[PDB]
Amino acid sequence: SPGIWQLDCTHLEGKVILVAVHVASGYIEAEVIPAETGQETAYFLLKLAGRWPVKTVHTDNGSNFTSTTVKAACWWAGIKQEDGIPYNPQSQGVIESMNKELKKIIGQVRDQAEHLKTAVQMAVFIHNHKRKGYSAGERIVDIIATDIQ
Amino acid sequence: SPGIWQLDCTHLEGKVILVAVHVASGYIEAEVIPAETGQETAYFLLKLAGRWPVKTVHTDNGSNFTSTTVKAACWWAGIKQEDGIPYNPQSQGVIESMNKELKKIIGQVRDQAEHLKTAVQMAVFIHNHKRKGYSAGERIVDIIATDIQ
Ligand SMILES: C=CCN(Cc1ccccc1C(=O)NCc1ccc(OC)cc1)Cc1ccc2c(c1C(=O)O)OCO2
Ligand SMILES: C=CCN(Cc1ccccc1C(=O)NCc1ccc(OC)cc1)Cc1ccc2c(c1C(=O)O)OCO2
């Protein structure tokens, strides 16, 4: 549970937003890329796993599950690469709701920057700091500190 | 002290590596950019502060301390922007030693990727996971969790 993350790919403005969600907390990291390739996804996972103790990633589609570059990054970074089959049907819903919330936030900040990447990092910040009372950023730290102890 | 970070700029292969270090733990985030500008530094701090509870940043030089774009991102993200004067002379040495360790790690992985940005993210991963016993990634989570509690 503390080490499990889910990849999610959404689209805006003709670009791709790649998201990793820490499933137990709802905390996210995200980036804009011009298209989802195995190299971009592999690089994104390398970044994530240098920052948080990523044990397992549920990939966002079969092409990223198949990609030998993504499998190579997961090998390098010590991550168990898994499929993203929603054996719990509530998973599809949680991810659709997250993309809709993120896109809502991006539209709320969109005029505050020229480049979509800037708006998406403002949206990561607001999402992670939003009190629901704890924020997603507080929950991930507590979950992982509990695991370390 | 759980919220205090230090910016650091180092050079390799004709490029710039921008580093944020969490002072109490030694944990780092880093990125490669073609040159250190106010916009690149402001974007980097926006990313950092959406991922960790960044209260204070000691900027790496007077150009980033002065930059109105850097000041605007620190306003947006709720960061107190401070200068980086090493009132403790041990601060100079610690940053120099970190740059030398990071460049050593980059040389140890350099032939495992074409692009320097890849090598630098491998080096962030190795640095954050190295036990010296706890790793910097463990120390930062424990420090912030203690603080939330
Ligand atoms: C001279 C700055 C260029 N713009 C000006 C702009 C252009 C259009 C609308 C608003 C603005 C505006 O000032 N908003 C406030 C602001 C300030 C700093 C800030 O720092 C994170 C983010 C936002 C902001 C910007 C900075 C760094 C970036 C960007 C962009 C971008 O516009 O996307 O892209 C990647 O790094
Ligand atoms: C598949 C083509 C790309 N190369 C091949 C390569 C070129 C030269 C030397 C070694 C290799 C090699 O296979 N090493 C192992 C490896 C695999 C996956 C991995 O994923 C993080 C990092 C490393 C690795 C790469 C992937 C993603 C990127 C990169 C680069 C890069 O070379 O820098 O740049 C930004 O995203």
Residue numbers in the entry:
A (entry chain B), B (entry chain A): 57 to 188, 193 to 209
Paper quotes:
From 7, replacement of the p-methoxyphenyl group led to 8, (R1 =  cyclohexyl) which gave 100 µM inhibition in the AS activity assay but with loss of SPR activity, whereas 9 (R1 =  p-MeO-phenyl, R3 =  allyl) retained SPR activity. Analysis of the crystal complexes of compounds 6 to 9 suggested that branched amide analogues could more effectively fill the pocket, so we synthesized compounds 10 and 11.
